[PDB]
Design a protein around this nucleic acid. Structure first.
Lengths: 96, 52, 64, 76
RNA sequence: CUUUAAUGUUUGAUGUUCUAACGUUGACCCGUAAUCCGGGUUGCGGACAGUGUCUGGUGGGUAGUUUGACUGGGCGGUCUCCUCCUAAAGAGUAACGGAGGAGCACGAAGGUUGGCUAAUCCUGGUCGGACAUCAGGAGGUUAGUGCAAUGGCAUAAGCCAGCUUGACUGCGAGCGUGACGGCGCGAGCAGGUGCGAAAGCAGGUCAUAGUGAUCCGGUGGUUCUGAAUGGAAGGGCCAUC
RNA sequence: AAUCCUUGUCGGGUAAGUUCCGACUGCACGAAUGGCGUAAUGAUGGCCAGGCUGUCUCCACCCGAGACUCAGUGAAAUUGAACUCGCUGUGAGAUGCAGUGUACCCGCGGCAAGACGGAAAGACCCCGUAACCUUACUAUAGCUUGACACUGAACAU
RNA sequence: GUUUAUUAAAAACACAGCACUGUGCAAACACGAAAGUGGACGUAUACGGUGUGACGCCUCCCGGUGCCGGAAGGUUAAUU
RNA sequence: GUAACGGGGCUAAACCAUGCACCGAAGCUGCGGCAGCGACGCUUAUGCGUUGUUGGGUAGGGGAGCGUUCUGUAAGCCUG
RNA sequence: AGGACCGAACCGACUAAUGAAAAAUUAGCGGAUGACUUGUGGCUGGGGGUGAAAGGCCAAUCAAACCGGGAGAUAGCU
RNA sequence: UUUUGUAUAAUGGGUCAGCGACUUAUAUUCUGUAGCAAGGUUAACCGAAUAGGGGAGCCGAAGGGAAACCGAGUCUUAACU
RNA sequence: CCAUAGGUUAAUGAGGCGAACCGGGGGAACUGAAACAUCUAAGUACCCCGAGGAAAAGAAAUCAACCGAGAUUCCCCCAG
């Protein structure tokens, strides 16, 4: 980013935003990844064990991505509407 | 650039303000115009205050 | 050694889904009262980086 | 000397010509005065910029007693 | 409350004296065969002087640097923006080519409704004259445009008056113009307004100059964030300097 | 004048003097970054005279050391390769191109007009975002100011 | 007298002399983080610095910049 | 140094006009050869009949190779 | 008597012409009892010394010695 | 060699022989190629051991927003044709 | 005056050299920032003191996050 002596593109443009420390401990979980665990019950801990989310992860959503066939009990996790619907269809249970 | 700048503040009691210029030599009296407050979403009287 | 990121660049740009780069417009920072409101409004939203200076940005930000 | 100065060229002039199909919004002419006047389905901006208000073919024509140039849009 | 006096006690500074810190490059004694040094006695000085830490001043004594480019090198002139010409009837187009302007103004000089039409000259007319104001005419924009020039302008964009805040907030099909940063034009949609009987017009001004990226901060709003938790600070976002 | 105009003007000196000496509108002398004098001194600057002379008119001869030849020894800078002429043009100053003229091959002694000869990556000039040398900026040693410390005791205002 | 060893010997430097100025002795000043040393085993008829440069006749302006003295007021640090 | 046709020379071997010949290049054509890139169609060893066309080249881009030393293949193979 | 005079040694280096010589020669030239010259030893060190001052001299090197190191400094230049 | 341009009288080379200049490491991207493929791959280390273990991690399969958050959507805005 | 300083003996240890590594005391500049001063180079080069076969560090007035870990050192990640 040296443009002769003209003020380079980065320096021209204003800085913005801030980093969220809470974003680094959240996670997104596909529907496909609910089968990867064992026991048919999906906690954070379980996910971690199954190497789906990672050790420093306090929070995790389940997104409508891929597809779930087996019935699953999602526990202590956020779920999107679509994802939730999918889970229901599969024959699964959801709980806070 | 003798013509100084000022801010018309909303009498709705919101923070909202417009900003503008005025010639303070020729026009000593305060500027009061009926401008649209977008927080209230109504046209309110806006009174001149110091830009600071 | 690992490539170091240009930290300023990182601050100023965010990579998008198709490998683009969004950025905040210039001219909406101070000296505002004189600027027409429409212009200001236009400036507000984030803007994609152009084809010309894309390369430079990329160079600056190897880890994106 | 006292004479080095000049301004940036403004790229005025007829942008779309006779018969050119235009999308509504498109600028037909940039100009200083109303060298061309706004005719049917053409708007005149604050800087006298004539622009299509409808999708169609540009149509230059002389009209009125003063014999003024008028740009219209023919329907399409 | 204005203004002081009384009794009780409390910091600030101001010199005079002292002798015990400290000084002694005064004297004598001893280590010692020793003009160093130390110890001892003593005189003088004395809480100063002088040292450390902090602090203002002074400081080419010394150090590190900077000291623009264009330019038929220096000196002079220039550097951003607007208008015209050069520019070869789309756009664009150089020269230390030819000519001029800008670094604002205006709460009306903006919006809208209603109305109006200029310069100059001639003839007549109190003071009144080449040139005020008033009649009759010729003239036809030769005038006017807040300021340069160009292009515009009578449906006036020129001149008067009434009511007003659209010099609105969120957006924006689609175009123009730039290497980019950006700059510009914009019908329409939502909300809420003003003028009008209404159709409508209004997101500043006849248009084109009146301007300055980022960083760093400042002010107001905003629970977006808040490093164990609750807050806060700081940060973000919107407005603005 | 250790004064641009300027070889100022007048006088002296010379047949003739932009210099020299003496005098009379200081471009821009001047009083201890001294003014004006000054005997003596000077490998000091300028000018004039006597003497002297090959300095010169204008060179001549002679004596030695080299140069030349023979024998012995034996360097150097330079060097793209050379079968290495003149002229007029051309190409921006021609041994090498064009046209033309001249010229048998090879030494030796001489001369220096050219080979933009040799020598030193121009010293001038400019450029490029080194070095040393003020009231530029920023610091700073030093000097200086106060506050606290080492630092205590009385008494008065 | 001195001077650019190796293109400059001079009108340059020095000089005796002159003047200003500092310095009271643990002197000013200089070399030294300091101890110390020079100044000087000197003491204002001495020592340092600056300029001028034998001898003779001489030698207005304090507004500017320095230095010296003053301290009434304004402004002004650490500290509080 | 002729030195302002390249020279000789020229009264046309100059100039104008019309015409028909010829010379004249690495242009075009002829014959032979190599290579690139496309078309179609073979029926294949992933290239072949062919068939068009292209092939000056600095900076530079792309493609395909030669050779050198060393390791394996190699206690192999060549070599008094 | 004398930073007195003329003049050898000795110290110098004004003019001249000319590798044996990385500053000499020959012919002349200045000082030559002094602020002279010279032998031996000593001391002063690099932003430092020393300097009758020329930016002179400090080992044929000086507007900041030499040696080694940072170091393959950097070189939008050849 | 450098140049708009060099027989140039612009640079460099007296000749020969030898040596003399785009490397290496680690990151990152794109191309080819091989593996496996919604998966791919392990690092240190253990293991006398180029095996095998080791999946700590990394990249990918989801994005939008400054962020909370939402999520095949999301941000914008009171709300979007 | 006693004492102490000092003095003479005796015993024990030290001293100096050595590649790198190690801990501590001091500590540049070129360079980069396309200039330059904060910054960088870099606590590098260098100088000095001390030690050991290794040194240093080390047994939480440490992290963590309402769950827990359990001295130091070193390697790969975390992460440019």
């Amino acid at each position: 980013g040296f443009e002769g002596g003209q003020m380079p593109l980065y320096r021209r443009l204003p800085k913005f935003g801030f980093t969220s420390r809470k974003a680094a401990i959240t996670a997104e979980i596909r529907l496909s990844d609910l089968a990867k665990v064992e026991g048919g019950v999906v906690d954070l801990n379980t996910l971690k064990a199954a190497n789906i989310i990672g050790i420093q992860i306090e929070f995790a959503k389940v997104i409508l991505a891929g597809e779930v066939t087996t019935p699953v009990t999602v526990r202590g996790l956020r779920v999107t509407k679509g994802a939730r619907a999918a889970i229901e269809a599969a024959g699964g249970k959801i709980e806070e | 650039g003798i013509r100084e700048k000022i801010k018309l503040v909303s009498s709705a009691g919101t923070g909202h303000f417009y900003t503008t210029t005025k010639n303070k030599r020729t026009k000593p009296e305060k500027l009061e115009l009926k401008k649209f407050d977008p927080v209230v979403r109504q046209h309110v009287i806006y009174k001149e205050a110091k830009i600071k | 050694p690992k490539i170091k990121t240009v930290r300023g660049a990182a601050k100023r740009f965010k990579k998008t889904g198709k490998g683009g780069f969004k950025h905040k417009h210039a001219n909406l920072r101070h000296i505002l009262t004189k600027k027409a409101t429409k212009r200001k409004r236009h400036l507000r939203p984030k803007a994609m980086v152009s084809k010309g200076d894309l390369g430079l940005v990329i160079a600056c930000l190897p880890y994106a | 000397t006292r004479n080095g100065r000049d301004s940036e060229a403004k790229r005025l002039g007829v942008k779309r010509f006779g018969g050119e199909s235009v999308l509504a919004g498109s600028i037909i002419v940039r100009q200083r005065g109303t060298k061309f006047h706004a005719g049917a389905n053409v708007g005149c901006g604050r800087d006298h910029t004539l622009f299509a208000k409808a999708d169609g073919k540009v149509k230059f024509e002389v009209k009125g007693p003063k014999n003024r140039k008028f740009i219209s849009i023919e329907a399409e």
